[PDB]
Amino acid sequence: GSMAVPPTYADLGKSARDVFTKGYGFGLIKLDLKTKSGLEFTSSGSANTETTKVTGSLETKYRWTEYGLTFTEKWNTDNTLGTEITVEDQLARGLKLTFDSSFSKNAKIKTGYKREHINLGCDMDFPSIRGALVLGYEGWLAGYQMNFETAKSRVTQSNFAVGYKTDEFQLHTNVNDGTEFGGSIYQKVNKKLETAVNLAWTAGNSNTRFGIAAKYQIDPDACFSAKVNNSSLIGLGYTQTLKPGIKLTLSALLDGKAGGHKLGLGLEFQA
Amino acid sequence: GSMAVPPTYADLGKSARDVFTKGYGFGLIKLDLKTKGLEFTSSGSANTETTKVTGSLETKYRWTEYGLTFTEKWNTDNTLGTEITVEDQLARGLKLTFDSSFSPGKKNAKIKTGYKREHINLGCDMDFDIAGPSIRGALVLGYEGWLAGYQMNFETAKSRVTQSNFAVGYKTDEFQLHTNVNDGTEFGGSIYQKVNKKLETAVNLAWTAGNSNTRFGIAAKYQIDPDACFSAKVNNSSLIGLGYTQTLKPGIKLTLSALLDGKNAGGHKLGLGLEFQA
Ligand SMILES: CCCCCCCCCCCC
Ligand SMILES: CCCCCCCCCCCC
Ligand SMILES: CCCCCCCCCC
Ligand SMILES: CCCCCCCCCC
Ligand SMILES: CCCCCCCC
Ligand SMILES: CCCCCC
Ligand SMILES: CCCCCC
Ligand SMILES: CCCCCC
Numbered sequence: 001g002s003m004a005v006p007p008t009y010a011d012l013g014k015s016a017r018d019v020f021t022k023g024y025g026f027g028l029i030k031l032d033l034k035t036k037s038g039l040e041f042t043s044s045g046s047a048n049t050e051t052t053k054v055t056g057s058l059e060t061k062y063r064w065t066e067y068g069l070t071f072t073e074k075w076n077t078d079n080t081l082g083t084e085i086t087v088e089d090q091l092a093r094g095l096k097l098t099f100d101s102s103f104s105k106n107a108k109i110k111t112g113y114k115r116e117h118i119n120l121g122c123d124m125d126f127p128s129i130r131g132a133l134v135l136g137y138e139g140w141l142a143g144y145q146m147n148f149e150t151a152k153s154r155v156t157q158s159n160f161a162v163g164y165k166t167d168e169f170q171l172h173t174n175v176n177d178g179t180e181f182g183g184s185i186y187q188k189v190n191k192k193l194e195t196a197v198n199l200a201w202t203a204g205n206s207n208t209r210f211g212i213a214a215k216y217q218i219d220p221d222a223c224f225s226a227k228v229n230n231s232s233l234i235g236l237g238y239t240q241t242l243k244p245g246i247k248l249t250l251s252a253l254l255d256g257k258a259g260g261h262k263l264g265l266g267l268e269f270q271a
Numbered sequence: 272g273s274m275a276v277p278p279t280y281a282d283l284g285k286s287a288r289d290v291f292t293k294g295y296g297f298g299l300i301k302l303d304l305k306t307k308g309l310e311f312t313s314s315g316s317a318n319t320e321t322t323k324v325t326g327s328l329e330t331k332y333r334w335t336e337y338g339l340t341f342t343e344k345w346n347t348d349n350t351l352g353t354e355i356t357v358e359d360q361l362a363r364g365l366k367l368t369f370d371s372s373f374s375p376g377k378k379n380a381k382i383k384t385g386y387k388r389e390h391i392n393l394g395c396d397m398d399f400d401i402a403g404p405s406i407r408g409a410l411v412l413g414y415e416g417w418l419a420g421y422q423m424n425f426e427t428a429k430s431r432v433t434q435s436n437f438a439v440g441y442k443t444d445e446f447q448l449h450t451n452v453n454d455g456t457e458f459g460g461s462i463y464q465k466v467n468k469k470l471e472t473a474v475n476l477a478w479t480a481g482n483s484n485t486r487f488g489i490a491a492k493y494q495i496d497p498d499a500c501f502s503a504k505v506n507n508s509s510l511i512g513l514g515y516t517q518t519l520k521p522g523i524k525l526t527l528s529a530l531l532d533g534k535n536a537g538g539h540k541l542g543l544g545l546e547f548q549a
C-alpha cells in the first residue's frame with residue numbers, strides 16, 4: 001500500500017497473505033479461462049485430487065463504467081446461481097454498495113465508505129450484521145470489527161487489529177474473539193524476492209504455530225514460491241507464463257512427518 | 272539445555288562464546304564487591320597498559336510482586352546510568368525496559384520491548400540517540416532444536432537499514448553449532464561441544480567476503496575441582512591465552528590470566544581479578 005487510504009479490515013496484511021496463499025494451489029487440478037475482457041466471461045473447471053470430483057463454473061460479468069455499475073453471474077455445475085450488483089463512486093466520492101443473491105436465499109447488502117485515513121465498512125446478511133472500521137495514521141493502521149447476530153441479539157466475534165506497513169515492509173497483528181492472537185511480518189528484499197513470516201497462538205494454550213514463506217521471481221514470466229511451518233509441512237510453488245495468453249502453475253505439498261502428500265496443477269487460459 | 276523458548280538473537284551461540292570470553296579478563300586488575308531485595312555492586316578496575324583506574328557503583332533493587340527492577344550505574348568518571356525493567360505484568364511472556372544515561376560522552380535513552388514465548392522470541396528496540404533514533408527488531412524461531420534468527424537496525428533519521436543479520440543454528444546442551452551472516456558480507460560459525468562435566472570445548476570460525484584468508488580459534492575450559500577451574504584459548508593469529516580461577520572461600524573467587532603473543536616478541540598481557548560476594 002502506497003496510498004493514504006487504508007485497506008479494508010479483511011484486506012489487512014494482504015501482502016504477507018499473498019506470499020503464503022497465492023502461487024500454490026495444492027490438491028486441485030483446475031482449468032480456468034476468462035475472455036472478452038465489456039462482457040467478461042469466465043469459465044472454471046476444477047477436479048479434486050482426493051475424491052476425484054470434477055466441478056465446473058461459468059461466470060459472466062457485464063460491466064459498463066461511466067455510471068459505475070458492475071453486474072455479475074456465476075453458475076456452477078451442480079446448480080447454484082447467484083447475482084451481484086455493485087455501484088461504485090456514484091452517490092458519494094468514496095461510497096460503494098453491493099447486492100447479493102443465491103439459488104438452491106443468502107441475500108446480502110454490503111456498504112463501505114472509504115476516505116483519506118479512514119475506511120469504514122458495514123455488511124447486511126440475510127440475519128447478521130458485520131461492521132468494520134480501519135484507521136490510518138502516518139503509515140500505521142488500527143482496526144476493529146464486530147459481527148452481530150440480530151436474532152440472538154449478541155455479538156458473535158470481535159476482532160481488533162494494529163499494524164504498520166509500507167510498500168516494502170508490513171507488520172500486522174489481530175486478536176480474534178479475545179482468545180486468538182495472530183501476527184504476520186512481510187518484507188520484500190528486492191523486486192525478485194518476497195518473504196513473509198507468520199505467527200499465531202491461542203490464549204489458554206501455551207503452544208504456538210509459526211510459518212515462513214518465500215516468493216522468488218527468476219524471470220518476469222517465471223517465479224517460484226516455497227513455504228514451511230513448524231507442523232512439519234512443506235510447500236513448493238512454481239509458475240511460468242508459457243505465452244502471454246496461458247499461464248501454468250505447478251506445485252506440491254510434502255508431509256514432513258499414512259504419509260499422504262498433495263500435488264497441484266493449474267492452467268490459466270486468457271483470451 | 273533444550274527449553275521450549277528460543278534465546279534472544281544476541282544470545283545465539285552463548286555457550287561457545289562463554290568458553291572464549293569468560294574466565295579470562297586479560298590486561299585488567301578488577302575488584303568486584305557484590306552485596307544483597309536491593310543490591311549494591313561495587314566495582315574497581317585498573318588498566319595494565321595505561322594504568323588508569325575506574326570504580327563503578329551500581330545499585331539495583333527488584334520488586335517481585337509487580338516484576339519491577341530498578342538499576343543505577345555510576346563510575347569514577349561522572350557518568351550516570353539508569354534502567355527500569357518490568358516483566359510478565361502486561362502479558363505473560365512480555366518484558367520491556369527503559370534505559371537512560373548521560374555522561375559529562377553523549378546523552379541518550381532507549382526502550383527495549385521484547386516478547387518471549389514457546390517457540391518464539393520476539394524483540395524490538397526503540398533507541399533515541401543524539402545522531403538519530405534507531406529501531407532494531409529481532410525475531411528468533413525454534414523448531415525441534417533448530418534456531419533461525421533475523422535482526423535489522425533501522426536508522427530512522429534518514430530512511431536506511433544499517434545492518435541485516437541472518438543466523439541459523441542447531442542447539443543442544445551437548446552440542447551447539449551456530450552460523451551467522453552480517454551485512455551480507457561477513458560469516459561466522461561457532462561449534463560448542465562439552466565432553467563431560469569437567470571439560471567444555473568451543474571452535475570459532477570467521478571469514479569476510481572479498482578476502483581469501485580466514486580466522487579461526489580453539490578454546491577449552493577444564494574444571495579441576497568444584498572450587499577451581501582452568502581455561503585455554505588460541506586462534507590462528509598466533510595468540511595463546513591462559514586462565515585460572517579458584518574459589519578460595521564461599522564469597523570470593525580469584526582469576527589469573529595471561530595473553531601471550533605467540534609469533535612475532537609482541538607485547539604480552541597479564542590479568543588478575545577478585546570477586547567478593549557478600
Ligand atoms: C521450521 C522448519 C520446518 C522444517 C520442516 C521440514 C520437515 C522435515 C522435518 C523432519 C523432522 C520431523
Ligand atoms: C507481539 C505481541 C505480544 C502480545 C502478548 C500477548 C499475550 C498472549 C496471552 C498470553 C497469556 C497472558
Ligand atoms: C465530497 C465527499 C462527500 C462525502 C459525503 C458522504 C458521507 C457518507 C457518510 C457515511
Ligand atoms: C514490534 C514493534 C513494531 C514497531 C515498528 C517500527 C516502525 C516505525 C518506523 C517509522
Ligand atoms: C519489526 C519491525 C522492526 C523495525 C524495522 C523498521 C523499518 C522501517
Ligand atoms: C439476469 C438474470 C438473473 C438470473 C438470476 C436468478
Ligand atoms: C490492545 C488490545 C489487546 C486486547 C488484549 C486482550
Ligand atoms: C510495542 C511496540 C513498540 C514500538 C514503538 C514504535
Ligand SMILES: CCCCCC
Binds near residue numbers: 410
Ligand atoms: C526468522 C528467519 C526467517 C525470515 C525470512 C528470511
